[PDB]
């Protein structure tokens, strides 16, 4: 399979209530492996997956240091962002960063990422070439100029093609019992009468890992995109995910409808019906 490692930063200012909170979470695919919170009793990088516990004391020290330094970094960023946008110091604001790498089944860099947002809006993004930037506005162009001057993309690029992929390769081998196991969905169709004239067919998928999945309804082999209610994939709490697609159908017509499921853990896509 193909795999990814991501670090997610959120820095949230809270005027009147102390210094901005800084949170970091690390993921391999849909599995959190590490966390850091500046609001913790004695803030450090903490393991969240058994396969990372492995790494020795120096790992944990070096990673904690990175997060303590970045706490200061993103706090400066927030102050700077206020100035660039001519904002008051009374309001609460949020900076987010995502960064990491995708690898293909042979474990070679498929692509790298480095993206920041300010207040839920695009701010700056490293382009896919790992050489140039996209600033969303004139504020973000100031950062771009600073980062261009300091040759930041070159540094990210060395990281993304180097340590990002090396560590993910190590994580994947250590956590291979879970990271490299796909769990197929457990699927069924339920039947809930709405009225004399109408019924809900609900197509369930349970117990699947990773999160990616396609669930569609067809009436007479035609996709029912507009006529389907599709819930967001939600976590179950045991590493697995859940989803359902629902269609309201006329009474007596349940057999014209088929549920289609695609998931990595399935050798071929599935077709289900209401089986009374």
């Amino acid at each position: 399979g193909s795999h990814s490692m991501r670090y997610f930063y959120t820095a949230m200012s809270r005027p009147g209530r102390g210094e901005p909170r800084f949170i970091t979470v690390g993921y391999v695919d849909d599995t959190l492996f590490v966390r850091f919170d500046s609001d913790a009793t004695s803030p450090r990088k903490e393991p969240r997956a058994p396969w990372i516990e492995q790494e020795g004391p120096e790992y944990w020290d070096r990673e904690t240091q990175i997060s303590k330094t970045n706490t200061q970094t993103y706090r400066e960023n927030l102050r700077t962002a206020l100035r660039y946008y001519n904002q008051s110091e009374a309001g609460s604001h949020i900076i987010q960063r995502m960064y990491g790498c995708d690898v293909g089944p042979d474990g070679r860099l498929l692509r790298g990422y480095d993206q920041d947002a300010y207040d839920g809006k695009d701010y700056i993004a490293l382009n896919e070439d790992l050489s140039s930037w996209t600033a969303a506005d004139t504020a973000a162009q100031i950062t771009q100029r600073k980062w261009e001057a300091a040759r930041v993309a070159e540094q990210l690029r060395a990281y993304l093609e180097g340590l990002c992929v090396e560590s993910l390769r190590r994580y994947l081998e250590n956590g291979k019992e879970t990271l490299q196991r796909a769990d197929p969905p457990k699927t069924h169709v339920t039947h809930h009468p709405i009225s004399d004239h109408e019924v809900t067919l609900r197509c369930w998928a349970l117990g699947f890992y990773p999160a990616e999945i396609t669930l569609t309804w067809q009436r007479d082999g035609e996709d029912q995109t507009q006529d389907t209610e599709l819930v967001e994939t939600r976590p179950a709490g045991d590493r697995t995910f859940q989803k359902w697609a629902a269609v309201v159908v006329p009474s007596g017509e349940e057999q014209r409808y088929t549920c289609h499921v695609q998931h990595e853990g399935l050798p071929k896509p599935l077709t289900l019906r209401w089986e009374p």
């Binding site: 670090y7 970091t24 690390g26 790992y59 990673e63 990175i66 997060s67 330094t69 970045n70 970094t73 993103y74 400066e76 960023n77 700077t80 962002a81 660039y84 960063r97 960064y99 100031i142 950062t143 600073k146 980062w147 300091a150 930041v152 540094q155 990210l156 990281y159 340590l163 990002c164 090396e166 560590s167």
Partner: peptide, 9 residues
């Protein structure tokens, strides 16, 4: 594993 540096805005 994270990268050493981050840079300010």
């Amino acid at each position: 594993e994270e990268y050493l540096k981050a840079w300010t805005f």
